[PDB]
Amino acid sequence: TQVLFEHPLNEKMRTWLRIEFLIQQLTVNLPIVDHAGALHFFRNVSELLDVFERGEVRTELLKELDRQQRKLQTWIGVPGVDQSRIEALIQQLKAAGSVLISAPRIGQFLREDRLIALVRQRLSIPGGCCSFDLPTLHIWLHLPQAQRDSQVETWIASLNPLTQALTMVLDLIRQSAPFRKQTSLNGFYQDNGGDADLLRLNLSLDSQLYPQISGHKSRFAIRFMPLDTENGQVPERLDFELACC
Amino acid sequence: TQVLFEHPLNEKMRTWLRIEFLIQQLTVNLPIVDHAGALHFFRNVSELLDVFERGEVRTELLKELDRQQRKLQTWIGVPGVDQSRIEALIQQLKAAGSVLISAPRIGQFLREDRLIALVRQRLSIPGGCCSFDLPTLHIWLHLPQAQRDSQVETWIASLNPLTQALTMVLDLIRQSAPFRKQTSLNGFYQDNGGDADLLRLNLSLDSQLYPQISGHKSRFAIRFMPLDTENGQVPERLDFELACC
DSSP states (O other): OOOEEEEESSHHHHHHHHHHHHHHHHTTSOSOOSHHHHHHHHHHHHHHHHHHHTSOHHHHHHHHHHHHHHHHHTTSSSTTOOHHHHHHHHHHHHHHHHHHHHSOSTTHHHHHOHHHHHHHGGGGSTTTTSTTTOHHHHHHTTSOHHHHHHHHHHHHHTTHHHHHHHHHHHHHHTTSSOOEEEEEBTTEEEEEOOSOSEEEEEOOGGGOEEEEEEEETTEEEEEEEESSSSSOOOOSOEEEEEEEO | OOOEEEEESSHHHHHHHHHHHHHHHHTTSOSOOSHHHHHHHHHHHHHHHHHHHTSOHHHHHHHHHHHHHHHHHTTSSSTTOOHHHHHHHHHHHHHHHHHHHHSOSTTHHHHHOHHHHHHHGGGGSTTTTSTTTOHHHHHHTTSOHHHHHHHHHHHHHTTHHHHHHHHHHHHHHTTSSOOEEEEEBTTEEEEEOOSOSEEEEEOOGGGOEEEEEEEETTEEEEEEEESSSSSOOOOSOEEEEEEEO
């Protein structure tokens, strides 16, 4: 009966969350059988390439992978903790890293693909991607299903070195911190984030509201606002759980 | 074993085909259960409003409805044809027309909707529509399914006067002309379209190619190009069916 809100506390976590989201959307509506499925797929690809054009994700994500290995290394001597399970986890990190750096250009396969590039151009036009403006797509959707599935696989698997490394670090961020109980007065809250990239906030579906998070330096502030901007309102004592990961 | 290609021969048919496509995409992936379904829905709405902003569809579509009534009126005296079936069809046209003109602003309900407008802004940003940038959407997808379905219904039904009238005329355009057998030499063809808005072209899935249609005045020209820009090519005698609707 709870709703989890994730909020990035730096431009790093923003990009990673956007990329994580865009990548998993590719594999959500498979297989591609119709226009809807195709346009959903290609647009997610198109939006992925646009994010990639903004800089090099490779360099940041590789620094983050190394960062996590050093943290796990701090836990070796601790009583009770098991060695061969984190060192295997460390070994998976170095593997995800070595593959990422040795990987080709990111999104280049998708960038160079004739059909995808031909759809990418027509996406910026509201009614652009119809059958008469994309006969090439229209004829592609009449092909045997097995031919499309093979193309889709090669397209998604080209993002495998990135997908791996990224999934690794986000899975290790979301496990680094526990949910601490906090309370808000009149729908307001603030704290010093510190050295965290991600806030994880559990509310309540029945609580009738959502968090609006702002930031300054390494500090954050939450103003809980009612989903209904008119019919419903914050209490003066709102209990919630928040993790600083 | 055939593939049908539709191509608009004027700016009218272009708009109508784009709108027809956008409207039916709304009802394709229902119900909205996740992000993918939601983003697909809202973007189609957003693209619909952008097309509406470009002019008044109402005026053209109403002139087209009247146009079809006059054509049906020409068929009254013809032997063999049945009266009460076209006059009922005529009566449905005048009904679709009277409702369209008496209808409110087109897309205004969707335009004014808080959630939709809040998503419309974030659609122009590649990774914009994530959970942390749209907490309002994130919390909406956690609501009971019955609440979303009710909202979706009110949203789609607001387009009912337009959807009706439009579906009427396109259904009457696609029935006005028969498929005549034609042949192309070395993948080229041209004719005088005349008073037609739509070309309907049947090829063959095994034919290994698609039509690339250009236009000048009321004339059109087709250059059949191989789907594989490298591995496959047009014959020198390509038989196909084409209707000038």
